[PDB]
UniProtKB/Swiss-Prot annotation:
Interacts with p53/TP53; the interaction is direct. Interacts (via CTD region) with CDK9 and CCNT1, acting as an associated component of P-TEFb complex. Interacts with RELA (when acetylated at 'Lys-310'). Interacts (via NET domain) with NSD3, CHD4, BICRA and ATAD5. The interaction with BICRA bridges BRD4 to the GBAF complex. Interacts (via NET domain) with JMJD6 (via JmjC and N-terminal domains); the interaction is stronger in presence of ssRNA and recruits JMJD6 on distal enhancers. Interacts with NSD3. Interacts with NIPBL. Phosphorylation by CK2 disrupt the intramolecular binding between the bromo domain 2 and the NPS region and promotes binding between the NPS and the BID regions, leading to activate the protein and promote binding to acetylated histones. In absence of phosphorylation, BRD4 does not localize to p53/TP53 target gene promoters, phosphorylation promoting recruitment to p53/TP53 target promoters. The NET domain mediates interaction with a number of chromatin proteins involved in transcription regulation (NSD3, JMJD6, CHD4, GLTSCR1 and ATAD5). This is Bromodomain-containing protein 4. The gene is BRD4. It comes from the Eukaryota. It is found in: Nucleus; Chromosome. Ubiquitously expressed. Changing N97A: Abolishes binding to acetylated histones. The chain holds residues 44 to 166 of 1362 of the full protein. The record marks N97 as: Acetylated histone binding. Residues 15-121 form the Bromo domain. JQ1, a thieno-triazolo-1,4-diazepine derivative, and I-BET, a benzodiazepine derivative, have been tested on tumors with success. Treatment with GSK1210151A (I-BET151, a I-BET derivative) has strong effets on mixed lineage leukemia and promotes myeloid differentiation and leukemia stem-cell depletion. Belongs to the BET family. Chromatin reader protein that recognizes and binds acetylated histones and plays a key role in transmission of epigenetic memory across cell divisions and transcription regulation. Remains associated with acetylated chromatin throughout the entire cell cycle and provides epigenetic memory for postmitotic G1 gene transcription by preserving acetylated chromatin status and maintaining high-order chromatin structure. During interphase, plays a key role in regulating the transcription of signal-inducible genes by associating with the P-TEFb complex and recruiting it to promoters.
């Protein structure tokens, strides 16, 4: 396994915004409880899951456990930065797999719920 994505970085500028607060309290914590959330709650363990090709294909890994810790650590500058991490997580799934796979059906449903929840954010 590669090292997991960082969740802290002292020289990176931090910020707390209403939208980032909402992304943790509402968006992530709601997605987390979905029946299809479990494959996305932690970095992919290529050794445990027997996916030796995973990090040969996926060069910008991301998962909701990392995102949750980044939100809790006020790692992001703005909501768009966190939204980009969700989008990276979803697109990684589509890239590593192919249409119709169970894991892709799961990501497709989670992506639709995610878009529903970020359609309107606080001001
Ligand atoms: C307990 O956490 C788990 C357990 C098994 C899981 C995953 C995470 C997450 C996966 C995953 C993918 C592809 C194949 C796969 O299994 C063949 C798979 O399995 C994939 O793209 N992601 C994100």
């Amino acid at each position: 396994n590669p090292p997991p994505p960082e969740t802290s970085n002292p020289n990176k500028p931090k910020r707390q915004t209403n939208q980032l607060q909402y992304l943790l309290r509402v968006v992530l914590k709601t997605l987390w409880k979905h029946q299809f959330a479990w494959p996305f709650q932690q970095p992919v363990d290529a050794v445990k899951l027997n996916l030796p090709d995973y990090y040969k294909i996926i060069k910008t890994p991301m998962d909701m456990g990392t995102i949750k810790k980044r939100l809790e650590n006020n790692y992001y500058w703005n909501a768009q930065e966190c939204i980009q991490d969700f989008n990276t997580m979803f697109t990684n799934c589509y890239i590593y797999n192919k249409p119709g796979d169970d894991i892709v059906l799961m990501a497709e449903a989670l992506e639709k719920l995610f878009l529903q929840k970020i359609n309107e954010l606080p001001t």
